[PDB]
């Protein structure tokens, strides 16, 4: 009786092909054997064949049918042998699926400080590691506040991968940002928080996890710097053990190596019983002498058992009856440590008997074993292998040690053949690509076999589910019963699994089967063979290195070169050729996959675990089983398309560090596949490391200490040689060795000192010059070693030498507007008699139009510290208004578009921290409960008009309108929660009509229609007070809300109201609440409201423009300094007005000829073209400040400004704010290096109003001083302080409402650099929205 075999793969994946195989016995030869599959949509023939006179094995590849009715479905594979009126038919239910393509997100770091650009890559792969070029529809980047802040649409992948960039804000939120891919199918999370660790790290080396067989131990508490340097200090070490707390404390001092050894004995703690905790903690507190700071180290040690657990990792699920089965057992203790000469007990349970036997192990922990199944006689048996007779002990009060017995159950190799085929496994991990040689012996039983035929072995090499290789070996069966062996040749790729299989079966044409499979263990390899090599991988920081990258031809690769501690932070979250695996292989265990068809619930028991869809006609019918250091910037993050040669050599420059760089790469190719490289290291080694401690802030005429500490790194004695370049910008006194070389040996430090005084101003560079020289004298009994590289170092560090006194700026903006004629203007700028010498500068700015001064200074505008929600919008909202001007006039080029939108997500990220859990936007954020409704209207207006430029989430605008629904009165008007606004035009108590006007005008400007219900409801509120209003700011804003809509009959009424209170200041008219050009604050924004109400007529009127250019002629001369309109809200309202005027009165501006003239016969020419209208034209005036002459000719309306800055010994005010300070503590006889002196500041508002709007007290620091560490917390603990900010030389403290009462704020400062002859330092308090109401005093130090 001849027999046949049909084999198909189990899972039928869509984008690739599979393989079908047919095995036919000698005999038949007239019977057509065919395989075909039937689906619900189509049917194709897989294979037709006819029998031969020999044993044949035919295998062909086939493409799967497309899936229908979803992704997962079940087809029917159908085998027919037809002939001699005999039909062998079957029907087997087989599963066909569209598999899930694997994908991952690779970020640049798992941890970023704020202010760094995040880079990431998105990679999609199939199950065979070929890249997928399916287009990503929409990808997003979200904050820790679950709010999307970036979004890319319709992004295409380049060879399956795509890279993206996102610049974070300098003030960014803290938490895990999330990159979401394809509506949230893929998440990549990276943490962003600000970590700076200047404290020296205290570590251990020899303390590790301990066992119970330890009676004594040595603890090496070693305290070292972040770059790595020992110091001398006293260490107290508490080694404690908790209770379900036996502790011992010791004290010592570290040596010159910095590692202190202490004997810790286990007998002082709980070691036998488990009534106490199983974890022992070491707390080391280090106090350095002369510092007083305490460094804390916590190290936990868990008590580990001596032995681990046994699992039958390499054990077959069957047994050969009446014939021996051999194998090996790997024995190891705890955490995969091999135990030499360990003892293993194995017991069999069955009907024959529960026999026990014992085995000894070798030094490698691999013990061979043989088992004889002569007496079992086809019965179900159980295997139990353990270490000893001891088992698990259960106790609710004590945590037991982990133990797991090696238990298995075996069921009866179901056949009619008693021949034997050998089992030959080869070691642990295997290699890929090399032809592996394996030998497997066999045996032939003469009773069930005939010597006339020839023997044949058919083997299937199966990996990643489907069968990969096949083959046949025909040998002579005339030798009959012997222990012969046959050879095999094996090629392994990534198509083979990490745990693939090889099955051999021999089948006789007279009758009988014998089968055996071997499970392998291959290292997770790839079709793409990549190599990330370095030259020379020991390079000095500063010189370029050669990176060689090898892959398959036609590949796209991606580098990630970063610090080693970035890899040491997270053991996971990197590509380590296990992360790219894992999601794919889960086909183990169960033979069907959502298929209810079974055979007897053996060949079925063989092909249950790793096998295929296999059917035959042999004996198969039997019931069987059916179941910690810093994180610097990253070195490389680049993309590289490599050529057909497969090599890519790139010269890349190392960063200036002392650390060791690690690089990781992956390569993607459509022809071959994916390839991942291990992390290959490059050490950046420098011989000597210097550290220049230098004060940022210093006043001229002071002195400070220049410091040039050199820390050795080589393990010998070197001769350093420090130098300072002599310059005329500073004078010096040599406290150092004065160009004398020293003997610095290994792990030894030296400190130099210089006394530096300053005679100039500005940024002054200090240049160090250190060099190991060729010594003529031996140091420490040995010759001074000269390294061949890194022999020199030239570090340059700057100082900011600010002048004494306070900076007073003076501006005189002009609006020469030539209507075909010559327009002239004189500028009068004068200096006081008490100016600080050589501190005066003057500069004239010429531009071709308006809305280009804001365009140059889109960042900034105000000179004020933007740390609140009402003031952040000078870096967000005039960008929207100037680009509305450039979009409605068609002058928006692409480069200013890209710069402005980059500033826009910077302002978006900075604004989004003032959002709440609700939709409202307060000023300071997360401390005010419910936010301000007016600022919510302002941010809703500038989010509605910015979503056509950048990506704004519509969810936060929708929550803003939900908060508008929450603040809608039944009278039709708009209310507010809390008392925190701008100047409020009189100090207004009601403010309801102006608030409702601004909310509804913001809704109309953002894009809502008149027939909108909130807009119509606010307008129905304002018909009540449409005419009867008195405040000029409220009248101009009310003329804006009635001029945005089409209520012209009362817009003309309000215009006639505004013509009564319009101050006719010559040819320029304007409006003011309380009636050289020094600007005021609220009159600028209310005449901006008047100008905005003028220019919102849809019908152009020539009489309207004649009044409008007079209002512009007043409004554009109030430009304070570089940005304009001194405060923040004044600036955004007046730039909105001037942008609306510039849209509604747009000019061609072909050419303007302008002459700047002065009294020193200094004249210069500016020429304005059409394209040259948006350049910030600048000239520093060399004249002594007096009068200047400005004339313009041509067609257009240009803007000219002149800014004068000088320094003044600051006079007091004593009429708006009363300000005083005094200095306590300060020692003056025991100064040391932390000269901690306190400052107590008494503030009050003695002005005319009931309360100031919002105040900034600006402690400009003394030279070389810092505000200690805890002053931020103890200033937030004091009342009426919302935010304290120390940028680089000033402490700005933000006050909510400063009043008639006197508030005392105290804070202590400590210097970092020693300073001598301290100049006085200023303290200034101003109203934020009225900066001219300021009070400036000065303080000093009573010692020097």
Residue numbers in the entry: 20 to 263, 277 to 633, 670 to 695, 730 to 1177, 1186 to 1454
What are the paper's exact sentences on this?
Human alpha-2 macroglobulin-like 1 (A2ML1) is a monomeric member of the A2M superfamily (A2MF) of protease inhibitors and complement factors. The functional inhibitory unit of A2ML1 is a monomer that depends on covalent binding of the protease (mediated by A2ML1’s thioester) to achieve inhibition. A2MF protease inhibitors utilize a unique trapping mechanism that pseudo-inhibits proteases regardless of their catalytic class. Trapped proteases remain catalytically active but are prevented from cleaving protein substrates through steric hindrance imposed by the inhibitor following a proteolytically triggered conformational change.
Structures of native A2ML1 were determined by X-ray crystallography and cryo-EM at resolutions of 4.4 and 3.1 Å, respectively. Overall, the cryo-EM and X-ray structures are very similar with an overall root mean square deviation (RMSD) of 2.0 Å for the entire molecule. Native A2ML1 is organized in two structural units connected by the MG7 domain. The N-terminal residues Glu19-Phe787 constitute the MG-ring formed by MG domains 1–6, the associated LNK region, and the bait region. The C-terminal domains CUB, TE, and MG8 encompassing residues His904-Glu1454 form a compact structure with extensive CUB-TE and TE-MG8 interactions, which we call the CTM8 body. However, in both structures, it is evident that the strictly conserved residues Arg730-Pro734 pass through the same narrow opening that houses the Nt-α′ in complement A2MF proteins. In particular, Tyr732 and Phe733 in the BR-C region form a hydrophobic plug inserted between the highly conserved Leu130, Leu216, and Val598.
